[PDB]
C-alpha cells in the first residue's frame, strides 16, 4: 500500500581515462523504470519499464537535459570534494546521490530523502524536516554552509513534497497492473543429508514481488537466528525475487523444524515443514 520513488546517481572519476562517468537509474518501489548513462553512444534518458514508454518525446527530452546538467554539476562537486579532503588529482573517486519520496495508500507524502556519499561513506543528508542538513564531517560542513547560504533545502523540499509525489502518483496509475500487484512467494522445503547424522533443510521463496520478505526457521517454535544460513534476497530477472534460508538438523529431528514466510502477497503467514 505504501510506495516510493527513488533516483540513484553515481559519478566516478577516472584520471587519465577521460572525464567522470555519470549514470542515473530511477525506481518506483523495486521496479527500475528509467536509466541515463553519460558513456552511452548518444546519451539520453531511456525507458526500462513498459508503463513509462507512453510518456511523450518532451518527457524524454526534458529529462535528458536535466541529467546532462547534473553530470556537469557532479563533475564540479568531485573537484570540490578532492579539495575538501586534500586529495591529489591522481586517484579515482566516487560520488553517489539518492533522493525521492515515500507515500502512503492515499498518495500522501510520508517522508522525503535527499542524500549523498563520497567514496562509499555518508557525506551529507537532508534531514526529515526537509529544511536542514546533517554533515558527516568537516568537509561536508563546508557544503552545508554553502547550501545554507544558498537556501538550497527550500528547492529540494519543494520538489520532494510537490513534483516527486505527483509524478509518483502518475506512474502508479499508469503502471497499476504491476506496481500495485504483490506476487506472493512460491515455497517449498528441500532436504539433503550431509552425513550419517546431520541433514540440511532449505526453505525456498521464489517468484515474489516486492522484494521485502521474512523467512525464518524455528525449532520447537524457537527462532533459530544464530543457526540459520540466510542468503541475500536476489532478483530472478523477470521482475520477481528469490530467497532461501537453511538450517542443519540432527537426522530424524526434521519434524521439529518449521519454516515461516511473511510477505505482502500473503494474507496470512505460511508455516512450512519438510514434506
Amino acid at each position: 500500500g505504501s510506495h516510493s520513488m527513488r533516483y540513484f546517481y553515481t559519478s566516478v572519476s577516472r584520471p587519465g581515462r577521460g572525464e567522470p562517468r555519470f549514470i542515473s537509474v530511477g525506481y518506483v518501489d523495486d521496479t527500475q523504470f528509467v536509466r541515463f548513462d553519460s558513456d552511452a553512444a548518444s546519451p539520453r534518458e531511456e525507458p526500462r519499464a513498459p508503463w513509462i514508454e507512453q510518456e511523450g518525446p518532451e518527457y524524454w527530452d526534458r529529462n535528458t537535459q536535466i541529467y546532462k546538467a547534473q553530470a556537469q554539476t557532479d563533475r564540479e562537486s568531485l573537484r570540490n570534494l578532492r579539495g575538501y579532503y586534500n586529495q591529489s588529482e591522481a586517484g579515482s573517486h566516487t560520488l553517489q546521490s539518492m533522493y525521492g519520496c515515500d507515500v502512503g495508500p492515499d498518495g500522501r507524502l510520508l517522508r522525503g530523502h535527499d542524500q549523498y556519499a563520497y567514496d562509499g561513506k555518508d557525506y551529507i543528508a537532508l534531514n526529515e524536516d526537509l529544511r536542514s542538513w546533517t554533515a558527516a564531517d568537516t568537509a561536508a560542513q563546508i557544503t552545508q554552509r554553502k547550501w545554507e547560504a544558498a537556501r538550497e533545502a527550500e528547492q529540494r523540499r519543494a520538489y520532494l513534497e510537490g513534483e516527486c509525489v505527483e509524478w509518483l502518483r502518475r506512474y502508479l496509475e499508469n503502471g497499476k497492473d504491476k506496481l500495485e500487484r504483490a506476487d506472493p512467494p512460491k515455497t517449498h522445503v528441500t532436504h539433503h543429508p550431509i552425513s550419517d547424522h546431520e541433514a540440511t533443510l532449505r526453505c525456498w521463496a521464489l517468484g515474489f514481488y516486492p522484494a521485502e520478505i521474512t523467512l525464518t526457521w524455528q525449532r520447537d517454535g524457537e527462532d533459530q537466528t544464530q543457526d540459520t544460513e540466510l542468503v541475500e534476497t536476489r532478483p530472478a530477472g523477470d521482475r520477481t525475487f528469490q530467497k532461501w534460508a537453511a538450517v542443519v538438523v540432527p537426522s530424524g529431528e526434521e519434524q521439529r523444524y518449521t519454516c515461516h514466510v511473511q510477505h505482502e502477497g500473503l494474507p496470512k503467514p505460511l508455516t512450512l515443514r519438510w514434506e
Binding site: 529529462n63 536535466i66 547534473q70 570534494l81 520538489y159 513534483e163 509524478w167
Partner: peptide, 9 residues
C-alpha cells in the same frame, strides 16, 4: 521525473 537545478557540493 528527476529534480533539476541541484547545486554543486
Amino acid at each position: 521525473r528527476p529534480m533539476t537545478f541541484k547545486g554543486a557540493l
